[PDB]
Amino acid sequence: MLLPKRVKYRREHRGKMRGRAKGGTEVHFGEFGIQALEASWITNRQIEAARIAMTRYMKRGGKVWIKIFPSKPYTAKPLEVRMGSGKGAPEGWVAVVKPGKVLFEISGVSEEVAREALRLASHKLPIKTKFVKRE
Amino acid sequence: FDGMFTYGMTHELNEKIMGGRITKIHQPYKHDVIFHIRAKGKNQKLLLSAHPSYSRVHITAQAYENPSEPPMFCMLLRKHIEGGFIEKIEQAGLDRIMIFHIKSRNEIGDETVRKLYVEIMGRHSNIILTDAAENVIIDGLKHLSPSMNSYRTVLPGQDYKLPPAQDKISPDDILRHLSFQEGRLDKQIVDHFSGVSPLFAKEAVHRATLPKALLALFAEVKEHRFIPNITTVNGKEYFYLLELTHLKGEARRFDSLSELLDRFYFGKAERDRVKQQAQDLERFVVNERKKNANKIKKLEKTLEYSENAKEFQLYGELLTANLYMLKKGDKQAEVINYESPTITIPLNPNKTPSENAQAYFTKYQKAKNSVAVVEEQIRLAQEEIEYFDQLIQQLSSASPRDISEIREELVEGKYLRPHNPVLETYESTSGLTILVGKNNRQNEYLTTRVAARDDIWLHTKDIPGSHVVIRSSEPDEQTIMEAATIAAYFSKAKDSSSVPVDYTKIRHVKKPKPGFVTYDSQHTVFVTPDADTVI
RNA sequence: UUGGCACCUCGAUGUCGGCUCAUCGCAUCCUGGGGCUGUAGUCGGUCCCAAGGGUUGGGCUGUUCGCCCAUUAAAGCGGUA
RNA sequence: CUGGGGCGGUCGCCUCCUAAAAGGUAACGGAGGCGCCCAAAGGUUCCCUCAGAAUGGUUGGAAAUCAUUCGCAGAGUGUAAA
RNA sequence: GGGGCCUUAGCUCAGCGGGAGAGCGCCUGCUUUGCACGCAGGAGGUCAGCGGUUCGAUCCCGCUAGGCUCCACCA
């Protein structure tokens, strides 16, 4: 469960997703990447689920260069409650996206292994993506 | 056990120490109270204890200690007792309550008098400041809340009580009321007199009618000469005030109780930790040795029964051979061992000749694997047995540093749990120096860390001992004979001469596993010995 | 179902459960017909096509639900204020 | 006041973000502060300038003080924020 | 229904990544005019389970499980 250990404000305004990825849209710390075609709000539990998936398919698989960090928190009020009475309480964390953004690079392991590992990684996920590699 | 010894002490210190304003009180050690008193108008020392082994009032040797952090116990002492005058040094009759009439021209000027009963009871004694006018405890040591059956309690609010004393005579005399044919008599001394311990009792039984000897040896106590000794008789160290009654051992004459118990016991006291450990480990190497010897003969006992493999294995081979005269639906067979017995086997109808042949091979390899597993288990077990015997081989020569060293060896064996301390050496009778491999690890340090290769080495040939080396000294006739001799009389076979130690170049000295080393390519030298040359 | 909004109804929309009458759906409870099986058979398990018909009687509790006894081939799950 | 009421919470003032680059803009939105303080913490004249880091070196010590170069600036600016 | 605490020795519990331990209790021998013992020890262990963590986990992470404990308005 990726975390920021320290925060300024426990809470935020929620945010939006328009446009496209500023940077990190291409594999250059690793060899064989995966990138977005969409965007959403994402959990460290999900990304580490993919981690364990790929690293068990590969069993130590190479090296990654993860591109992201779940900086954003989100709240979740208690249950069967009405509106108002102040903002809800912080619940977990969130990792945000823009399309064209790369999430995981890979290196040290064969391209075909990469393809299938990231297949099993991708099928976890709510989004549409594709494989990439370095220029 | 009772207070004739204690009352002699009481009188011989009452002669001395009366006339004392209590000056200082010192205790870091848990139950060793150091006092200074203005006794005989002198700043005069004293030691006290009620430790569950140690209790004595001791015009002592060099005192140990000054805490600068005394217990709140000692602060109650400095509160009530310090500045206290010794009116008198009295016995509560004869049982071991040594009364101390503590007057005090205290910080006021009032003459606050109290008792300080010390129930000197050896192991479980109790120094008790009993407020005399009220007979109330104001600070005590041993509890019995009365959470269970017995009688009295510490608490400094608890009113003081005397534990129930017993029908002691406090002295032919036996013939009037009793009989000395009552039975075994030392137990009955214990039952019946206040001149008691079971040992002091039986020694009195040997001091041999008898009650004249009793009251006249008390008259010797009244002479108050009693040249003390510690009779080391079979290690029993009877600290006994006239020279030994009986059992005829030693007599270590301490002219002073000052040195009698402290410098002896304190000399023992560290060693008494060493002997706690040594005797725990005595009982425990005894255990683990006999323990696993039992469990492994038990392994063998359970083992001998079943093989159930090659029977039906060879017949599975037979059916594989005669795999063209078979039905799946038979029990019996017809057989030749290429030998020709014609066994008619069981063959399990509704199951094929193949199926039952390879099932015979299955049970074959199965019993094979089970028994081979159990036999490598038992091989581990036998190497473990002689590993106990090897541990013991070294242990019979082990010193207390080797006790700790083998406690480390058994952390290594996983069996125990408690810095360069390699090994030691001795003066050979031939004016040389022989390195004494005194343990497994001490042998590693004396041979594998210290000694040189192609040297003269030696180990006790099947005797419980330690190893030795004339390291980088090619042991000649004299040197090799002297080294083999030191081994031959340092082993547990020290009575057996001709200890045939194999010596040669240490280059061939094997090493393995772990602790599995050997001295091979070596010619044996049979030796006997004396002892004191080693030093 | 538990819930959120406060949108019709406060110049009135009777609210639980039960009886009688029911009746629509079917992700089927039994019965029809299938394929898979780690389905020997017999019983089974899984999934599919299938709503034509059918899907008990009582003790406890106001109850519902649930429990219990004995059945049945089975004693379904929802809607309709 | 109240996303029915009730409990609870708040009720006035100030700083910020929400606030959509003039300004303004609500919610039982998000966050912090006040019911003061200095008679020198003022007015004026004159003066020089930091925060930390490195080096070195008593007690000095990781850390007092210290020279030492680095050093718009990391400190200070009575007080929250800006 | 939700929140908080907790599962380690037969009992009570600490330990809180690189060695599973204190005491109560059972067993072993010491010995004890308080029958009180104490002594030394010894055995006695799924650190509740699963998963991840790490080079390795009682310990770090998440989940589940339970046990406890606190709090849960009007039709």
Swiss-Prot record, chain A:
InterPro entries tied to this protein: Ribosomal_uL16, Ribosomal_uL16_bact-type, Ribosomal_uL16_CS, Ribosomal_uL16_dom, Ribosomal_uL16_sf
GO biological process terms on file: translation
Transmembrane segments: none
Signal sequence, renumbered to the chain: none
SUPFAM superfamilies (UniProt xref): Ribosomal protein L16p/L10e
CDD domains: Ribosomal_L16_L10e
Gene Ontology cellular component list: cytosolic large ribosomal subunit
rRNA-binding in keyword set: yes
Function: Binds 23S rRNA and is also seen to make contacts with the A and possibly P site tRNAs.
Subunit architecture: Part of the 50S ribosomal subunit.
HAMAP family the record matches: Ribosomal_uL16
Family indicated by similarity: Belongs to the universal ribosomal protein uL16 family.
Protein name listed in UniProt: Large ribosomal subunit protein uL16
From Swiss-Prot, chain B:
Region annotation (HhH domain) ranges: 172-268
InterPro entries: NFACT_RNA-bd (IPR008532), RQC_Subunit_NEMF (IPR051608), RqcH_bacterial (IPR043682)
Coiled coil regions, renumbered to chain: 266-323, 352-414
Single Gene Ontology BP annotation: rescue of stalled ribosome
GO molecular function, one term: rRNA binding
Residue numbers spanned by region Coiled-coil-M (CCM): 269-418
Phylogenetic lineage: Bacteria, Bacillati, Bacillota, Bacilli, Bacillales
Gene knockout outcome: Not essential in rich media; synthetic growth defects are seen in double rqcH-ssrA mutants, further exacerbated by translational inhibitors spectinomycin and erythromycin or at elevated temperatures. Decreased accumulation of a stalled reporter protein. Double rqcH-rqcP deletion strains grow normally in rich media. Triple rqcH-clpP-ssrA mutants cannot be generated. No change in sensitivity to erythromycin; double mutSB-rqcH and triple mutSB-rqcH-ssrA deletion strains are hypersensitive to erythromycin. Loss of Ala tailing.
HAMAP family: RqcH_B (MF_00844_B)
Disulfide pattern: none
An example Gene Ontology CC term for this record: RQC complex
Note: Activity of this protein is best tested in a clpP or ssrA deletion mutant; ssrA (tmRNA) encodes the SsrA tag added to nascent proteins in stalled ribosomes by trans-translation, which targets the nascent protein for degradation.
Function as written in the Swiss-Prot or TrEMBL entry: Key component of the ribosome quality control system (RQC), a ribosome-associated complex that mediates the extraction of incompletely synthesized nascent chains from stalled ribosomes and their subsequent degradation. RqcH recruits Ala-charged tRNA, and with RqcP directs the elongation of stalled nascent chains on 50S ribosomal subunits, leading to non-templated C-terminal alanine extensions (Ala tail). The Ala tail promotes nascent chain degradation. RqcH, RqcP and charged tRNA(Ala) are necessary and sufficient to add an Ala tail to a model stalled nascent peptide; does not add Val.
Protein family according to the UniProt entry: Belongs to the NEMF family.
Gene3D superfamilies referenced in this protein's UniProt entry, alphabetically: 1.10.8.50, fibrinogen binding protein from staphylococcus aureus domain like, ibrinogen binding protein from staphylococcus aureus domain
Expression triggers: Up-regulated under secretion stress conditions, possibly in a CssR/CssS-dependent manner.
Subunit structure: Associates with isolated or stalled 50S ribosomal subunits. Binds to RqcP. Interacts with ribosomal protein uL11. Displaced from the 50S subunit by thiostrepton. In crystallized 50S subunits RqcH is variously associated with A/P-site tRNA, P-site tRNA and RqcP, an E-site tRNA or A- and P-site tRNAs and RqcP2(YlmH).
Domain remark in the UniProt entry: Has 4 domains; N-terminal NFACT-N, central helix-hairpin-helix (HhH), 2 coiled coil domains with a beta-hairpin in the middle (CC-M), and C-terminal NFACT-R. The NFACT-N domain contacts 23S rRNA, the A/P-site tRNA anticodon and recognizes tRNA(Ala), while the M beta hairpin binds protein uL11 near the base of the bL12 stalk.
Region (NFACT-R): 419-535
Highest taxon of source: Bacteria
Residue ranges, annotated region (NFACT-N domain): 1-171
